[PDB]
Coordinates of C-alpha atoms in Angstrom, one line a residue:
Chain E
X1 CA -74.5 -1.7 -86.4
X2 CA -77.6 -3.4 -85.2
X3 CA -77.7 -6.7 -87.1
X4 CA -74.0 -7.6 -86.7
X5 CA -74.4 -6.9 -83.0
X6 CA -77.6 -8.7 -82.0
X7 CA -76.9 -11.3 -84.7
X8 CA -73.4 -11.9 -83.4
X9 CA -74.7 -12.4 -79.8
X10 CA -77.6 -11.6 -77.6
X11 CA -78.2 -7.9 -77.1
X12 CA -81.2 -6.1 -75.5
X13 CA -84.4 -4.7 -77.1
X14 CA -83.5 -1.5 -75.3
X15 CA -80.7 -0.8 -77.9
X16 CA -83.3 -2.0 -80.4
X17 CA -85.2 1.2 -79.7
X18 CA -82.3 3.3 -81.0
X19 CA -83.2 1.8 -84.5
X20 CA -86.7 3.1 -84.7
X21 CA -87.2 6.6 -86.3
Chain X
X1 CA -85.9 -9.2 -70.5
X2 CA -85.3 -12.2 -72.8
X3 CA -82.1 -14.3 -73.9
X4 CA -83.0 -15.3 -77.5
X5 CA -80.5 -14.7 -80.3
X6 CA -81.7 -11.9 -82.7
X7 CA -80.7 -12.1 -86.3
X8 CA -82.9 -12.1 -89.5
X9 CA -86.7 -12.3 -88.9
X10 CA -85.7 -12.6 -85.2
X11 CA -83.9 -9.2 -85.0
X12 CA -86.6 -7.8 -87.4
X13 CA -89.7 -9.1 -85.7
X14 CA -88.1 -7.4 -82.6
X15 CA -87.9 -3.9 -84.0
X16 CA -91.5 -4.4 -85.4
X17 CA -92.7 -5.0 -81.8
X18 CA -90.2 -2.5 -80.5
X19 CA -91.0 0.8 -82.4
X20 CA -94.4 0.1 -84.0
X21 CA -95.4 3.7 -83.7
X22 CA -92.2 5.6 -84.7
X23 CA -91.7 2.6 -87.0
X24 CA -88.2 1.4 -88.1
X25 CA -86.2 0.2 -91.1
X26 CA -83.6 -2.5 -91.1
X27 CA -80.1 -1.0 -91.6
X28 CA -77.1 -2.4 -93.5
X29 CA -74.0 -0.5 -92.4
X30 CA -70.7 -1.6 -94.2

């Protein structure tokens, strides 16, 4: 998902926007 | 534009400053 991906390595806040609403 | 690891409050504080308007809710997919 989003935690196992940015918490497993460094992702981008751009993909963090796909977890808004 | 950063290179910091995102996990608990780190990945969370991010969404908070990412959506703000639309909002957001931590997700826990199996």
